[PDB]
């Protein structure tokens, strides 16, 4: 019975409670599942091309505002006139502009040079950055075929090529596929084969952040197991500078003097940043490296502000408060905010007042206010993804970056509260009892205000074990071109010469699991970091020394062929058995299958090399009754080893006695059947 | 407690069941709640306004 239903009811109470404990953690993962930053890829103003080089721009306080690009064929002579109202002229005399957005690798993807010429530089910088953000995550970019992986890339329509009405000479039908923000999310999903939702957001100076908010939703609801979010503003023609000049809003120097009294305009910059978003449960279950965690992102509009361009105060507060409420975090839980900091003399005051309202009203410690645009410039639709890059790197390095051109804090902002500390000096941000949290704000010119909360990656990665092994795992690297093959060994050699002490097995695992099998492959089995960087120094020039090189287009399945007699030496299985645990196991298995019918156990005979196999009227394995069983014993074991290391035969071929091995390894006969 | 052997734990089961019902309905109100089309505005070819 049930103590008169006492057990019964309680037994039902133990299920309605356990179901409630499971139906409430489902809501908590449907609305507030912490989504992680698996990997980070960026092309930002200056020399920045990787997230680690971008930290070499924030930590040493370098400004990326250098000057206008000359690669793009910009006129540069009608761009500047003494008259500020002359049509066709720009006001900023510089800004951080990408020096590599003009160039692209067409042959790497399935893109023709004719097609790639018409591809928007915004779009051609999301295919390479899609490849980078996947290789940095340890996820082979070609492994994500027909998989749910949504793409959320934010752009601005802008203008790259000629008028679509007039067409072109060489580029006629691919002008469309270039100058369309739509395909700027579908092209990435097509080249990488991603089946996940390909949304191309458009939200002016907040596009990227907004995109991540959407992506966050995708992972929280579960539409896409992987999210691919970020934004870009690549600047192909000087038109956009010419016309923000018409509102007299660009800083003549092109510098984003965020929260500064010398703010004479919001300036401009062109750049790109990209993120790989995955829910923390999926990211850690699949082993994907977690760099930081987005907890909550909110997106709102300025409403009826003082025009479409002017920002709104209360709406900005309502988005930096909603993100906290949606993330389950608060004003005191954020240690350092990354505000928009567009740089105009009007946006910054109201923007700082909003920060002083949601955060500064209730602060235990001074909030470390920063702005990535100070070091870079206003990257427009790439702002919001550059800001999250700044916070995560500040989190991974334990240091808060400087806000350049912020020594003279703005006189129009009341800093007397002290709850907000402008980051004019590098403030240490060490890991402690409080989980490190940050906030990135982007307020676009369209009026859409967005804010995201970035918690530090939960420090559960610690606890890894250490060991040593004799397995010289091959250092496999592949490229789409011979020159790229010679460049993927030079960059790796530089990385293993500028980041020394990285274990060889760790390097092989990342090079093998994390790099796509591209149709120009070079592979070698290193024994030391000096015998490897020497091979990596010969592979960079093209000399195949101690390595294997081969172009292998349209090739993915091995056949195992089985030679007959001819290796009369028979002195190699000893070294393989002593160093391979399987070769001391599978060889034992086949020998123990040969013994019931042929009493000769191979292992005592194997340790007898050819040097000790010629005394008692014998030669190097010439006894047919003795050579054939020991030929087979090594023969089946070796085929098991290629299958134990992951190579399966597509076909089997047996010259004379390989037919016996065809019986065993192909499943036609068992080990006992084949050995007999 | 007093009558038979369940009048306090049964209240807890009742509350837990109601909480599960109000929490599973929340799941279906967060991923499967019908979304009504309040009105349509359209500008289409052929003079459609």
């Amino acid at each position, epitope marked *: 019975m049930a103590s008169t239903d*006492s*057990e019964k009811v*309680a037994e039902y*109470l*133990r299920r309605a*409670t356990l179901d*409630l*404990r499971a139906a*409430r953690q489902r809501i*908590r993962e449907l609305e507030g599942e912490p989504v992680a930053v698996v990997a980070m890829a960026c092309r930002l103003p200056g020399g920045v091309s990787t997230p680690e080089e971008f930290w070499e721009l924030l930590s040493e306080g370098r400004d990326a505002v250098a000057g206008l690009p000359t690669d793009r064929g910009w006129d540069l002579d009608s761009l500047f006139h003494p008259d500020p109202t002359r049509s066709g002229t720009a006001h900023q005399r510089g800004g951080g502009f990408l020096t590599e957005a003009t160039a692209f690798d067409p042959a790497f993807f399935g893109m023709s040079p004719r097609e790639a010429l018409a591809v928007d530089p915004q779009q051609r910088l999301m295919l390479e950055l899609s490849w980078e953000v996947l290789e940095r995550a340890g996820i082979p970019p070609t492994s994500l075929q027909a998989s749910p992986t949504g793409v959320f890339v934010g752009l601005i329509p802008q203008e790259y090529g000629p008028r679509l009405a007039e067409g072109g000479e060489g580029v006629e039908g691919y002008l469309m596929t270039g100058t369309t923000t739509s395909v700027a999310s579908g092209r990435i999903a097509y080249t990488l084969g991603l089946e996940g939702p390909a949304i191309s957001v458009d939200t002016a100076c907040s596009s990227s952040l907004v995109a991540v908010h959407l992506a966050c939703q995708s992972l929280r609801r579960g539409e896409s197991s992987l999210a691919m979010a970020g934004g870009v503003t690549v600047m192909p023609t000087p038109g956009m500078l010419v016309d923000f000049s018409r509102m007299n809003s660009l800083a003549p120097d092109g510098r984003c003097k965020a929260f500064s009294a010398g703010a004479n305009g919001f300036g401009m910059a062109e750049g790109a940043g990209m993120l790989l978003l995955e829910r923390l449960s999926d990211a850690r279950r699949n082993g994907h490296p977690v760099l930081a965690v987005l907890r909550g992102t909110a997106v709102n509009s300025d409403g009826a502000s003082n025009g479409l361009s002017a920002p709104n105060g209360r709406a900005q507060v309502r988005v930096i408060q909603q993100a906290l409420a949606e993330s*389950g975090l*608060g*004003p*005191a*839980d954020i240690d350092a905010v990354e505000a928009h900091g567009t740089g105009t003399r009007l946006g910054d005051p109201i923007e700082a007042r909003a920060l002083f309202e949601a955060y500064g009203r*209730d602060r*235990e410690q001074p909030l470390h206010l920063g702005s990535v645009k100070s070091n870079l410039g206003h990257t427009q639709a790439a702002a919001g993804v550059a800001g999250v890059i700044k916070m995560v790197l500040a989190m991974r390095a334990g240091t808060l970056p400087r806000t350049l051109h912020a020594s003279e804090r703005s006189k129009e902002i009341d800093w007397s509260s002290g709850a907000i500390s402008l980051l004019d000096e590098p403030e240490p941000w060490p890991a402690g009892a409080r989980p490190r949290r940050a906030g990135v704000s982007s307020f676009g010119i369209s009026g859409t205000n967005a804010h995201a909360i970035i918690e530090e990656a939960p420090q559960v990665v610690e606890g890894e074990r250490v060991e040593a092994g004799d397995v010289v795992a091959p250092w496999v690297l592949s490229a789409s071109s011979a020159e790229g093959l010679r460049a993927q060994a030079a960059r790796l050699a530089a990385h293993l010469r500028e980041h020394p002490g990285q274990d060889p097995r760790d390097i092989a695992y990342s090079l093998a699991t994390g790099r796509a099998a591209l149709p120009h492959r070079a592979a070698f089995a290193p024994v030391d970091e000096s015998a490897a960087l020497r091979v990596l120094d010969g592979l960079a020039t093209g000399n195949a020394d101690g390595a294997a090189v081969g172009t292998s287009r349209a090739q993915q399945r091995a056949v195992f062929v089985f030679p007959g007699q001819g290796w009369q030496w028979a002195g190699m299985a000893v070294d393989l058995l002593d160093t391979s645990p399987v070769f001391a196991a599978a060889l034992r298995e086949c020998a123990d299958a040969l013994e019931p019918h042929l009493d000769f156990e191979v292992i005592p005979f194997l340790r007898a090399e050819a040097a000790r196999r010629e005394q008692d009227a014998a030669l190097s394995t010439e006894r047919v009754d003795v050579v054939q069983p020991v030929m087979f014993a090594v023969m089946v074991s070796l085929a098991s080893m290629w299958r134990a290391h992951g190579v399966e035969p597509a076909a089997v071929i047996g010259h004379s006695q390989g037919e016996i091995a065809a019986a065993c390894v192909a499943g036609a006969l068992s080990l006992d059947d084949a050995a007999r | *407690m*007093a*009558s*038979t052997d369940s*009048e*306090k*734990v049964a*209240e*807890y089961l*009742r*509350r*837990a069941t*109601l*909480d599960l019902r*109000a*929490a599973r309905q929340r799941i279906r109100e967060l991923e499967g709640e019908p979304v009504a089309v309040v009105a349509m505005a359209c500008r289409l070819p052929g003079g459609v306004s």
Partner: antibody
Amino acid sequence: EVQLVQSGGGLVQPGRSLRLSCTASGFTFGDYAMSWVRQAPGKGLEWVGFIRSKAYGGTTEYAASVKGRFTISRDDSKSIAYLQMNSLKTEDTAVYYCTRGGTLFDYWGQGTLVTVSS
Amino acid sequence: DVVMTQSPLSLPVTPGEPASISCRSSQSLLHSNGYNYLDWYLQKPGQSPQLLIYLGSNRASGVPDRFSGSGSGTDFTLKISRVEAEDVGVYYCMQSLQTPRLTFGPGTKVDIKR
């Protein structure tokens, strides 16, 4: 949805009867055991009593200070819970509450300011 | 005997700050069913009390997840994750094991901390 709005406040002298009704709407009245709570002004709550569900049957258990004075009844067809006050005295000057359970007061009526002053 | 249930009866808590209220139970409220039999009640000043957490840890529906809960065999802890300008009132540590329920306890004066 659930509401347990009350009614029956007023001003009385020590020694007369008063009415307290608990309006039930939104649920099956016969499932839960209706209970009654008394809150002294500005200080600690004190529990009065409850009636068990008619499916349970049981009895009507009251607090030690209201033996022989207060009685509690219930009905499904008209869905009102009763707290009958008889031989009232000074301590009864408090805001009474109607709670949705004998051991689990999950719901809580808004409160009727019952005053017994001379 | 009657189990003596007593909490730190004062909790100065300030908005945006995590607090933690515990409770004494002289006897063991961990019943044989494996579930604690203690209730967490909040009497809102000028409004009716509210069911926050039942069975020691299980939160009720309607109230925010702020009120998280747990405890040992005797020692209990309502982990209010965070307090706001609304989170200020009287918290009652009510044992629901030996009916009658006359005493709700003196109650905890939860106050805006300054």
